[PDB]
Structure formats: structure tokens, C-alpha cells
Amino acid sequence: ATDTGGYAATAGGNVTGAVSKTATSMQDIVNIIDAARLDANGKKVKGGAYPLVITYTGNEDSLINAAAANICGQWSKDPRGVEIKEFTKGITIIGANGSSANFGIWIKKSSDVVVQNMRIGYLPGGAKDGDMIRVDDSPNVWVDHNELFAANHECDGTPDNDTTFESAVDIKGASNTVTVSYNYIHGVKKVGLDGSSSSDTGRNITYHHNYYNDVNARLPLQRGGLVHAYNNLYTNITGSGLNVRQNGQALIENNWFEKAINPVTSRYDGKNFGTWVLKGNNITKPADFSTYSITWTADTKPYVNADSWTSTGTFPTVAYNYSPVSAQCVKDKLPGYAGVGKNLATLTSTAC
Numbered sequence: 001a002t003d004t005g006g007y008a009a010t011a012g013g014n015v016t017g018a019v020s021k022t023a024t025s026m027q028d029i030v031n032i033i034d035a036a037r038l039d040a041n042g043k044k045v046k047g048g049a050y051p052l053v054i055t056y057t058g059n060e061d062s063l064i065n066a067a068a069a070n071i072c073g074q075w076s077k078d079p080r081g082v083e084i085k086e087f088t089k090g091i092t093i094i095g096a097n098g099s100s101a102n103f104g105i106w107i108k109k110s111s112d113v114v115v116q117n118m119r120i121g122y123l124p125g126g127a128k129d130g131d132m133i134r135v136d137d138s139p140n141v142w143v144d145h146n147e148l149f150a151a152n153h154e155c156d157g158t159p160d161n162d163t164t165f166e167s168a169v170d171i172k173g174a175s176n177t178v179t180v181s182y183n184y185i186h187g188v189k190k191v192g193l194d195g196s197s198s199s200d201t202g203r204n205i206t207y208h209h210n211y212y213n214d215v216n217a218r219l220p221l222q223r224g225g226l227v228h229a230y231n232n233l234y235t236n237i238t239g240s241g242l243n244v245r246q247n248g249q250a251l252i253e254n255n256w257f258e259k260a261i262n263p264v265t266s267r268y269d270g271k272n273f274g275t276w277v278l279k280g281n282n283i284t285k286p287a288d289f290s291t292y293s294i295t296w297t298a299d300t301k302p303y304v305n306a307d308s309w310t311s312t313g314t315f316p317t318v319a320y321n322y323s324p325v326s327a328q329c330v331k332d333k334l335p336g337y338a339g340v341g342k343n344l345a346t347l348t349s350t351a352c
Contacts, residue, residue, distance in 0.1 A: 005322050005346075006179030006206025006228065010140040012092035012114030018051040025058045026103045029082045029093070036087070048089035056095045056118065063102035067122035072155035075163050079125025081106045081134075084113060095119065095146075097341045106134045107141060114142045119340045121149040127163040137173035145182040147339045152187045152214045152238060165189060171205060171220070172196040178205045182346070184339035186213040194248075195223025198269070201246045207232055208322070209330070209347060211338040214238070222248040222274060226316065230254050230324050231347070233334045240265050244274030251315040254280035254324040256331040259293045262305060270301035275313020278306065282327040285309055325352055 002009040019036070023029040032054055039049045067074055080103035084091065092114040093105065100119040107113050115133065123130045132148045135141045148168040155164045168185050169192035171178050185191060191212070195201055201224025210232045212219060217239035220227065227242070227250040234241060237260035244250045244266045257263045263283075266273040283292060286309055296307050304312070325333075329352035337347045 003321070004142045004144070004179040005181055005208055006320060007177040007204040008140050008142045008179035008206070009177065010112045010114060010142055011090065012112055012142065013051045013053040013090045014092055015051045015090050018053050018090070020053045020055065023054050023056045023058065026080065026082055026101070028058075029054060029056065033084065033087060033091075036089075046086070048087045048091075051090040053092045053094070056093060056099050056101070059098065059100050060102040061100050064100060064121050067102065067124070068151070071122075071151045071153060072164065074122060074124045074165065075126035075155065075158050077124030079128045079130035080104070080123065081130070083108060084110050086110060088112065092116065093118065095340065104130065104132045104134065106131065107136060107138045109137045111138060112140050113138065114144065116145045116344060117340050119147045121147070123150070123165065126165045127159050129166060131166045131170050133169045134167070135169070135171045135175045135178055137175060139174065139176040139178070141175060141178050143169055143178070143180045143183065145338070145340065145342060145344050147184045149185065149187045152189050152216055154189060162190070167192050167218075170196075171203065172200055174202075176203055178203065180205065180207045180210065182209045182338045182342075184211045185215060187215075189216040191215050191218045192220050193218055193223070194220040194225070194227060195246070198223065198246055201225060201248070209334060209338060211334050212237065218243065221245070222250065224248045226250070228318060230322065231330050231334070233330050234263060235259055237261060237263060240267065242276070243267060244276055245269055245272065246274065247272050248274040249313055249315050250274065250276045251318065252276055252278050252281065254327050254330070256282045256327045257292060257294060258282070261295045262297060263294055264306035265303060267299040267303035268301065270303070273304045276306060277311045277313065277315045278309060280324070280327060282331065283309060323349065325349055
């Protein structure tokens with residue numbers, strides 16, 4: 001099936017003729033993809049020779065645990081990541097239960113890529129683009145059921161005072177359709193952008209069933225296009241949540257917000273504010289701010305906060321088929337479906 005519950009329509013490497021391989025380390029993954037580019041005669045095939053399903057059984061807890069004990073020593077180390085560049089035959093990277101990685105997955109100019117059940121945390125190289133997951137010029141990508149974490153903290157003396165750790169899921173370029181679902185993102189200062197600059201506007205992204213906890217900002221930092229965020233659990237947001245910019249449009253439905261500062265805003269540009277359609281969230285009116293500990297702040301430049309909690313624009317017909325659960329149900333159940341080791345389980349109404 002190609003249904004991801006969002007804009008991305010892909011099965012990744014789970015197609016006809018897929019070759020399954022087991023990777024026990026980051027290097028194995030690199031070698032497997034390289035080999036996957038060669039045809040029967042040893043010649044390279046543009047976009048890849050065959051579809052792949054790579055099961056990653058490696059474990060780097062030692063690296064992660066060492067890093068967690070010395071947070072400020074990570075930004076200056078070499079970044080570590082597997083680059084999936086120009087591979088379009090279809091590929092899925094599934095972590096085995098118990099597997100872990102102290103390296104990121106960088107997708108560049110590829111298509112039909114699915115990343116699931118990977119536990120990635122405390123990556124080194126925040127000063128040199130050490131992102132956990134990067135989707136660049138890559139349409140039909142599905143980032144599902146992963147645990148992305150670090151420390152929601154900024155060490156002193158880091159270059160730009162923003163490089164202690166890099167992003168969890170940055171999306172940029174022509175990654176026209178992307179679905180980010182069932183991820184447990186925690187302890188991340190900059191979760192992920194949707195457009196790397198003011199000119200990098202566009203794309204149709206869906207964020208559904210994600211559990212965010214102790215994050216500072218960018219859920220996402222949207223530049224143009226459309227974003228459909230539904231059934232996400234937003235708790236302990238220390239800076240700002242969805243920042244809808246450059247005239248982007250967002251449909252924010254049936255989510256649960258709690259202990260969040262500026263959960264829905266449009267700030268930092270001073271102009272071209274985006275719009276949002278609010279519906280079915282735990283917060284229905286301003287009276288609820290106090291109940292769920294939702295605070296608001298101003299910005300030095302013109303900005304717009306959803307402090308009136310009203311829709312400020314419209315949203316096109318949601319192309320795909322999805323069935324949202326209630327905000328209460330996500331609050332109650334989501335933590336047991338999002339993340340690694342949940343066997344890619346989905347939250348249905350029957351479980352509410």
C-alpha cells in the first residue's frame with residue numbers, strides 16, 4: 001500500500017523485486033546502497049538498479065550514553081550520517097527492535113524513501129550539519145515510527161549559539177510530498193524546518209501522530225506551501241510551535257497542546273504571515289489557555305499569534321484519506337503508538 005496517512009504516497013522499498021539486506025552498522029548501510037546501484041553486469045544504473053529493504057540491526061547505545069553524559073562535547077566532533085543520494089528505485093530503512101544509531105540519514109534528490117523504527121539520538125557535529133534526518137529535494141518520503149532525541153539545551157560558546165545539536169527532521173528543496181508520522185521527538189531544540197529560506201517556499205507536508213516532548217521550536221518552521229498537522233501530542237514546547245510563514249497555509253486539527261509557549265504563531269519575518277485553520281484541538285477557545293498552560297509572547301517584529309484561537313485563512317481539500325482520532329484519545333493513547341518498538345502500530349478509533 002502507498003497510504004501513509006499524509007501527502008507522501010510511497011511503499012519505499014517494499015515493492016515487487018525488492019532485495020532485503022541486513023545492515024549491522026552504518027558502514028554496512030553505505031555498502032549495501034552502493035551495491036544496489038549495480039546491474040547484473042557490474043555497470044551502475046542511474047537511480048539504482050533494484051529496490052531495497054534494509055533492516056538495520058546495529059546498536060550504538062555506548063555512543064549515545066557517552067554523549068548524553070557530556071552534551072557539550074558533541075557539536076565539535078565530526079558529523080556522522082548515511083547519505084541517500086539520487087536513489088529512486090525505492091528504499092526502506094527499518095531498524096530492528098533494540099537497534100540504535102548515533103548517526104543521521106541524509107536524503108538528497110531521491111524519491112520513495114521510508115525510514116522506520118530507528119532510534120537516533122545525541123548526534124555529534126551540530127556545528128557542521130549533523131542532522132538526524134534531512135529530506136532535501138526528495139518527494140514521496142515517509143518518516144515514520146522513529147525516536148529522535150538529544151538535549152533541549154544550548155551550550156556556551158557554540159558557533160552562532162544554535163549548534164549544540166542539529167535538527168531532528170529538516171525538509172527543504174523540492175521535497176514536494178512528505179509524511180512525518182508516529183515519531184517520538186524529545187529533547188530537541190530545533191525540531192525541523194519546512195523550507196530553508198524565504199525563497200524555498202512550497203511543498204505539501206503532513207505531520208500526524210507525533211509525540212513532541214521538551215522541544216524548543218520549529219514544529220515545523222513552515223515557509224509557504226501546505227502543512228496538515230493532525231493528532232499530534234504537543235507537550236512542553238519551550239519556544240514556539242508551528243510557525244506558519246511566507247504565506248503558508250496550515251490545517252491544525254485534533255491535536256493536543258499542553259505546557260506550550262506560542263504553540264501556533266507567525267513570527268520572525270515581520271511580513272507575509274501565513275494562515276491556519278484550527279479545529280478539533282483540545283484548545284477550543286482562549287479560556288482554555290489557562291487550563292492547558294498555554295502562554296504567548298510578542299516579538300520584536302510584526303507577528304501574529306493565534307491568541308484569539310480563530311482560523312485566519314482557508315485550506316484546500318485534503319487530497320488523501322485519513323481518519324483522525326479525538327484530541328483526548330491522542331492525549332491518552334498516543335504515547336504507546338509513537339516511537340520505536342511499537343511494531344509500527346497505528347492509533348485507531350477502536351483503541352480510544
